[PDB]
Amino acid sequence: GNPLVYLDVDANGKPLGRVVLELKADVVPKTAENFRALCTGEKGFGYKGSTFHRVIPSFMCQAGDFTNHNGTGGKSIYGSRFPDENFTLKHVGPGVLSMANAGPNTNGSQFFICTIKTDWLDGKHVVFGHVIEGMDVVKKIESFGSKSGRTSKKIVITDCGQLS
Numbered sequence: 001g002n003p004l005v006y007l008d009v010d011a012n013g014k015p016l017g018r019v020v021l022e023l024k025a026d027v028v029p030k031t032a033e034n035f036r037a038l039c040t041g042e043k044g045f046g047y048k049g050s051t052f053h054r055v056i057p058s059f060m061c062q063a064g065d066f067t068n069h070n071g072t073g074g075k076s077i078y079g080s081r082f083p084d085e086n087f088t089l090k091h092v093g094p095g096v097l098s099m100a101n102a103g104p105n106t107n108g109s110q111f112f113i114c115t116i117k118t119d120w121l122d123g124k125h126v127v128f129g130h131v132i133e134g135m136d137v138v139k140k141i142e143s144f145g146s147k148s149g150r151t152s153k154k155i156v157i158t159d160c161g162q163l164s
């Protein structure tokens with residue numbers, strides 16, 4: 001089966017709730033495994049204690065830069081970057097979970113959750129899962145962003161892990 005993982009997210013130290021994500025290991029096993037392991041922290045690094053550093057309302061919420069905390073960093077469980085696995089899954093609507101990148105074959109740990117259909121990203125960003133529950137929490141995160149992407153409170157992944 002596919003992994004279920006979770007992110008517990010706070011704003012300025014106040015809890016927003018839990019986002020539960022299905023990782024599509026049946027379609028993108030390498031990409032799913034990277035995210036899963038970064039949620040559990042089992043490689044010695046991962047998302048716990050890192051931030052949503054760019055949040056654009058009516059677009060997406062971006063996170064995963066646990067090295068630089070500014071959109072320049074992050075790393076994968078495999079190394080500093082890994083190839084685009086495939087583009088089979090598309091950016092079909094709110095709740096799509098997809099890899100940030102710096103061009104072709106530059107996946108690390110940064111990711112985004114869509115708050116709209118972002119189909120102009122199809123074929124360019126690897127989609128590897130979706131929100132199962134806690135879309136309301138994603139909307140709370142979205143409310144602390146701005147058109148520039150700069151957040152108005154510090155949005156932190158206080159805890160994360162695997163449910164199954």
Ligand SMILES: O=C(CN1C(=O)[C@@H]2[C@H]3CC[C@H](C3)[C@@H]2C1=O)NCc1ccc2c(c1)[C@H]1C[C@@H](N2)[C@H](O)CO1
Binds near residue numbers: 074075081100107112
């Ligand atoms: O944030 C972006 C660009 N970017 C956007 O501007 C749009 C926004 C709307 C949907 C998403 C977010 C989309 C997006 O990806 N690039 C930063 C980045 C991402 C991954 C990696 C790196 C840097 C580092 C480390 C590691 N991985 C590799 O070693 C490469 O260098």
